Symmetry: C3
Subunit: 164 residues, 3 copies
Amino acid sequence: ATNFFIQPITEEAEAYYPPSVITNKRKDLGVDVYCCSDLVLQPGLNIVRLHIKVACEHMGKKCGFKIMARSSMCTHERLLILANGIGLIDPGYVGELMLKIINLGDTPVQIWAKECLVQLVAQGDHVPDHINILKRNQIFPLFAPTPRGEGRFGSTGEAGIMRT
Amino acid sequence: ATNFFIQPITEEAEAYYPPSVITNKRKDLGVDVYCCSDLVLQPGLNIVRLHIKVACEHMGKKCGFKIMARSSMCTHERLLILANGIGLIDPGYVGELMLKIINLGDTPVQIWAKECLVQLVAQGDHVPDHINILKRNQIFPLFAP
Amino acid sequence: ATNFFIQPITEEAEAYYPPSVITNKRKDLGVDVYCCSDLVLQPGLNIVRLHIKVACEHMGKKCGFKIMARSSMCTHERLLILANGIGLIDPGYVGELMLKIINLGDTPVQIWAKECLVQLVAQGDHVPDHINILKRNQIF
Ligand SMILES: O=c1ccn([C@H]2C[C@H](O)[C@@H](COP(=O)(O)NP(=O)(O)OP(=O)(O)O)O2)c(=O)[nH]1
Ligand SMILES: O=c1ccn([C@H]2C[C@H](O)[C@@H](COP(=O)(O)NP(=O)(O)OP(=O)(O)O)O2)c(=O)[nH]1
Ligand SMILES: O=c1ccn([C@H]2C[C@H](O)[C@@H](COP(=O)(O)NP(=O)(O)OP(=O)(O)O)O2)c(=O)[nH]1
Ligand SMILES: [Mg+2]
Ligand SMILES: [Mg+2]
Ligand SMILES: [Mg+2]
């Protein structure tokens, strides 16, 4: 069984993420996630919050996942790419999901709160069975402190904490 | 057993996809796919058709797959990237594969029909055993809506 | 069990890859690898050598793996992307790992030998148990 757990962590996320269980009858690989706020992306790098904490679990164990562009993210009107190509979300991450979006155009670009620019894909590309939208308040076991915690964007250092 | 199935759906695709079964003796992860038409890529975003329907099957089940750039897609002469980083193809998708390619340069670039800019990779990165090039003029149930 | 094997093939790599066994207690998906040389990345495409040969094994069999940017590779100061999005390394490949990096900015940019810009990820995204740093030119 492959399940995603999404918890809204702002008032804005609560508009798009009511407490519910979503099934994946279509068997799509990706879980679309909302901007939740109207965005203005400047030419160059933009750091964008997704207003959610996410956990993935496969065969009953907490696992990693990937952030991938939707094919609709990039249009003639909006030349947007994920800076990191895909987002590699480590099993131990329990912070807010963030995006690095490059606007390749010369003009600032507007995104609606209701748009999904990206999709979450389980470690190993397993088709999700259920998407669990958790209550904003609750404590969830899978968000418990880890060695990584909310460490992201070079939190591990230049050498990679991995090191060698 | 991981198998790919490619059906050409245009006469342009029939030039590059003769009916056959390709084995993957080298155990490469990626299945190279042809442009099938010469194209000029304008600076900015370009929509490129791949002229094929594809199915992947793993352990007897229809699965998804991914479209990745070949390391040779991007040269000094042609600063090309996949707009979406990786193409994510759902198990239920039975239409023509399409690419969104960005030309990051100031100047239009020529691609040739016989070039492969991208490669297909099974859901979960399983090494393909066979690539079945299907006859153009059939309705295969694997491609049913 | 999922293990990486890194074999330095230059003296520059030897200086950053002393023989050793790294356990992945954090259970991170990616193995960070050094640039091993100071480099200046020009606007447009830059070919960057990683000074290493790498093997990945899963359940005692040699497998492929992938090269991805670290989320920290791209910043306001260094607008850097992997040209191919992710590098796909076939299980059959035994040569040096190479990068194609695009500087999207108008200005050259400095990268440092002790910097890791990219990470390796096993075929199938398996969490690595061990990273084995081998001796220079030591076979798998
Ligand atoms: O697109 C992303 C990518 C990563 N992340 C988070 C989760 C991930 O576990 C954490 C670390 O990502 P990387 O390991 O891929 N980047 P880096 O190695 O530079 O950061 P760190 O040193 O903290 O591991 O950053 C995002 O929120 N969005
Ligand atoms: O690079 C690609 C990506 C997707 N596709 C096809 C197959 C895929 O299952 C389908 C939808 O892909 P995305 O989820 O990335 N696009 P989006 O979410 O914007 O549209 P849709 O609502 O149809 O999923 O489009 C391509 O042909 N090439
Ligand atoms: O980023 C990369 C990508 C690939 N490689 C290596 C490993 C891989 O097995 C080999 C082939 O890569 P691609 O299949 O993506 N490039 P291409 O298909 O253009 O060349 P080839 O015909 O040699 O496979 O080059 C790298 O060193 N770095
Ligand atoms: Mg979609
Ligand atoms: Mg190849
Ligand atoms: Mg990291």
